[PDB]
């Protein structure tokens, strides 16, 4: 449930990476806060685009760190039709607007990336899939918590979080092991009993292979769909306790053909690498 | 020139910006290391998207900090025609697969940046336009540097980088203030001699305030073109010291309607808030 | 391979720990830098505790940021029979010094953290148990890298490394969710396809109510050994996927009372919680 | 002084700074078990199972001020712990308290065997009739040392050398390093200047001897064997009176009356730190 | 406005500096906590020295950090007349006494510089010169945002804050660049439109060149003043949209001799590199 | 001690962070500048424009090590300076120098006016016969604490008290705070134990003997007029002839021979890093290709 999401962010965590974006913005002196000055104000924050709200922790907190308050007028997860009265900030005029950039980047940031999984989530639910879309690591350096939890918002995955997660055996991996036998054999040496291994295949040989070698995922990467379902129906017949990802190449008009009875999970870098941003302004409105 | 730009990023810089991105990405043991052990590799770099590399410097300091040395084949900025291999990185196998996401990433991104920057500044140029294209603060969080960078390789102007840069006077500070005269006045006053003061207005009202005021830039925001250019002629005709900036709602496609001999900057958020990321690779062979 | 485990830890990592500690311990002025002067000089690494050499990366990278060079005698994971000469350290003199109680303080606590580990590793083989052991979350906070480290040099597990890992359902857990099918059906969710989930079980119908539900582990905490393995004997028969982890008051001395057929992994919080540092020093030859 | 008095030596700044490094470590990304737990306001109780003395509610209460919870204490700091006691009550949203809870616990756990350890050896100390202090050393693990040093306070013992900034301690490798122990010391009391006190380890007589006539505050008799610790501190404070004697190497909560004299002023131990098995402590929901 | 020029000071910047200075004076153990405990407290704040008070937001956040509260009975830029009690400090005993060095030593140097600064500005005002008495780079590494903010509440300006302001253009650049007007070229085309370009001249021609190629700001270093204001005026004379800035052996005696009507910025690095400290002091007077 | 081997007390990774930070404060983001004068192998040669002693080789080494620049320098740590002097050279592209300069300046110059001012002192105590030890506090700019001390003992004074872990100062506020000067001692001893001294700032003979009497190692004699100081000190040193005492309050270069004499220890002088002006430094580049 989207309103509960916000439990999986510690506040320390988002202090830290809120003050840093802040210091990005301003590392010295703020010269504009002396055209605004102090006097207690109140801005509204309006939605321009169509999608999911998503980032209100992450706005909050940098409006906590500047001493403002906001107020939501929707949840966290809310459909946003345009042009919509989203919140209120309420603070010291220079506060808010020292805030203003940095707030609005992030939520409309969050919010692309929560619309993208939300539109894919839908195009996989239409299709009869039961199935989950996911994320990848394909995140802007840095900003992986929010891409991450605007992911979770619109009803996405976030899946492979860090390289300390599952064990993800890319065809890479392969290649310096020599061959996938050794390279599953070894992550599963490495995850033991913690973690997962997941094996990144071309083809159904290799997907055998790593099954065979006791992978928990088989990723079959830049299948066409019509290889891609035969391939996991020869595969949960014969390991049916696998799990089988489908990545590579998927996009949103395309991803009902990814989607048969036999995937489990379908992958899409383009959630993260290219989900325009939603357009939101923040209005001062009145003053003192 | 694309291939000088690398000198703007202070060393000291990228790499607590890489450390910061590695750290995020591999926050405590790095299990996959047990995979491929450390024998010395090689990887090809592929492009798989077309448009401008940029990022070169970002994506070296990420493979140095983990002692693996990279071989470009074509320079900075050089156009991207798929599928073209394009550099080699060397090292051993498990510090190469460490860097492969994070580095990536980073050029993905600064060269979709670069990309629609190029494809921006080549509309204006079609035009015939002598103004420069720019990008804004619209950045995402932590990244600026290197968005700002890719803007650069693509042509652009990085433009307004940060809040201590001019004294930027947006709507916000004109209702605070009480008009646009009071808040240019506080401006100029903060601004003194060392800062510009650019003013974003709204309406051919305001546009005229500011420029009366004495501000340097005028933002003339959110103009449709048939407004903008009659708005931008008067300005330039009293106040030639001012320099005109159109920005809102422009889009490569509507870019050329903006674009006019009384305008010297267009400002385009979609530079960075819209730019796909180019498709990349590295294969260990 | 306890050789090839250094491979896990990146070295931007190592480097930002490293200058922690040796910022705790020297803050300012190094007084005593002007008593030893900067000649170039050597010391010799003495093993004055049985057990097994464990830390050899987090030493060397001390040494490494004070500009100063390791030689190792033994392998890392290489049994110590003491009074045993275990590397050479040469640079500076006030370098050496410098880093020698750090260095020596790191050394000490992985090594006997790996001592543990290998006893415990031995104690459950001599038992002819084939499951593995494993540590816990109960490291000494900020030293979690080194304890764990330690841990897998030893032999055992590093097993739950973080609150990112697996989604661990405590009795606390079970207590906020109001139960154990709320709880584990919750950590599911949270868990989806990349995580594992565990769930703490005090007795057998919590167990099957945690198989039931889907978990992938099942702890079965502070069970007398006399009820454990039956109680894991049902589950293996009826849960043939679930994997089942034994721990609470495990010790070094009862360990093999808590292997058998039905149990995959025994966590001791010993092995990070009450492993005495082994009695190392460095002395200048 | 006083165990409760204690706490004021810790910077809340510093304090909160080392808190945050440890729930980071602890949770660098997601916390997903949160969503198991949910935000409702809830209780729990802190409970010692082992005996010892408790020590670390500063850091423990750091800890959970950051998570936005509060600590109820039952028990002032450097209580003498009897199992199985109720210490304290921590209040919270459920998910905070359970994300605070292992490295609170591991914090009190250490912080607490380390006091008891301390606690333990003091007590020996005294048995003994010795009126001198009983010490710690900088054989603490790396990054964890405020937390080390305060334990031993709550336990009685003195911290004594904190870090290289602190007095100035000249070894054996020093000695090796300057070419001897007049040299050595020489350059010691020259760096140390009125500000700080010179420390000698010393490992025979004629080494301290040395070590005193050069200006030292301390002389560390390091390693003897107790039969020649006294007659080699009695000789040393006859011909030296101001110097402060040090008794360090090989001692234990066992032998340590041993090393108990009239002209021994310190005893340092190292495994108070080094070998100091953690309490038991849990937390647990209601 | 003094009072005013707090608001260019953003919290987040404030606490991070103010908890490296506590760091930095208390790295572990405050030993001295013991000796005068915890019990509620009063310290009174006096100026011992004549000048301008300045530093109060730094002051405040240092015993904010450290649970204590400041009443300040000066406005910020208040001519200190001493002896003068200027503010109490309430808080536990241990807290007033472990945040009274660093915030003495941080507002007795930002009131120095503030005085400095001051006396520069009467100067400049008593020559009937209309123009800005300015700072400088040269600041102490890490303290630059307390030395330009104490600058400010003496009435000079900041102005050259950091290498991300304006393009200036030294001796060394035009070396570099070989040549006066490669390097402005250079200069102008980093700068584009957001930033201005200034050029350290030290003869007419240079400063000529300078402005054909289009510096905004001209920097006339080391001249005399006979020699300075003869080449200000033709300077102006030819190019009426260039400012002109002198710099270089300027000190409060000399500073009206380098004061004309063609001078529109004097900067000084004694203001910040030869400025006293103030003497205050903090007595706790009250405990419990 | 020596100058020259100063540079030991300063551990490499300390000065790399610290560094590191000054370049950050002085360039945030892009250094545009670098386009002007690209990246081309040059020279610079640092000129000392004033009188003094040379400290702060290594922060200045440091900062131009992290830009990938090498110094050479002419001259040894602790050097006289007499102006107009060529000191060093810097090389490495062009842009680094230049990046690298205004920070390293402004570092040496600090360092060096501290190191002139403390030499002087030390002078002016010699001139008088006095044989004590002049020292510095904790009046330091916040953050910098490590270069101006360091600067103090370039200049032959001592660092003395560094920070709040170092010796136990049981000042007059302490005094008030804890209910009087044996209260007050009695604390900060049990605090200090074995350890650390401790040092109690006086106002009169008569405190002094109340904190010798309570244990301090070290009485600090606050603003006593000369008159008072050297009676009270005389019979004070009488009866703890094992306390050493220390004068300050109101000390300048010009009275500093008034508050040496035999009973006197240690001098402490706020000034010395309150009131030093920085020496004027500048970096020429000369030469590039």
Known sequence: ??????????????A?????????????????????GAGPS???????????????????????????????????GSKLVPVARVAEVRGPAHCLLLGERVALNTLARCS?????????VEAARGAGWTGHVAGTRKTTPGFRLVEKY????????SHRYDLGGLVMVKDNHVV??????????????????????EVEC??????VQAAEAGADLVLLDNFKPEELHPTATVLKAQFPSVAVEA???????????????????????????????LDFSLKLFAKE
């Open 1 to 14: 449930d989207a309103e509960g999401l916000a439990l999986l962010l510690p506040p320390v965590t988002l």
């Open 150 to 157: 605007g992911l979770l918002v619109g009803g996405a995955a």
């Open 247 to 277: 990545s590579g190449g998927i996009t949103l008009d395309n991803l009902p053909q990814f989607c048969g009875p036999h995937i489990d999970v379908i992958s899409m870098g383009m959630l993260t690498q290219a989900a325009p941003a």
């Open 112 to 120: 692309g990336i929560a619309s993208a999984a939300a539109a894919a």
């Open 202 to 207: 071309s083809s159904l040989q290799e997907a």
């Open 42 to 76: 109140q801005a509204a924050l309006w939605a321009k685009s169509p999608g999911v709200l998503a980032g209100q922790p992450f706005f909050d907190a940098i409006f906590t760190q500047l001493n403002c308050q906001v107020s939501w007028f929707l949840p966290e």
């Open 176 to 197: 310096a092991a020599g061959g996938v036998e050794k390279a599953v054999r070894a992550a599963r040496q490495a995850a033991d009993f913690a973690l997962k291994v």
């Open 16 to 36: 830290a990476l809120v003050d840093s974006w802040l210091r990005e913005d301003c590392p010295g002196l703020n010269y504009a806060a002396l055209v605004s």
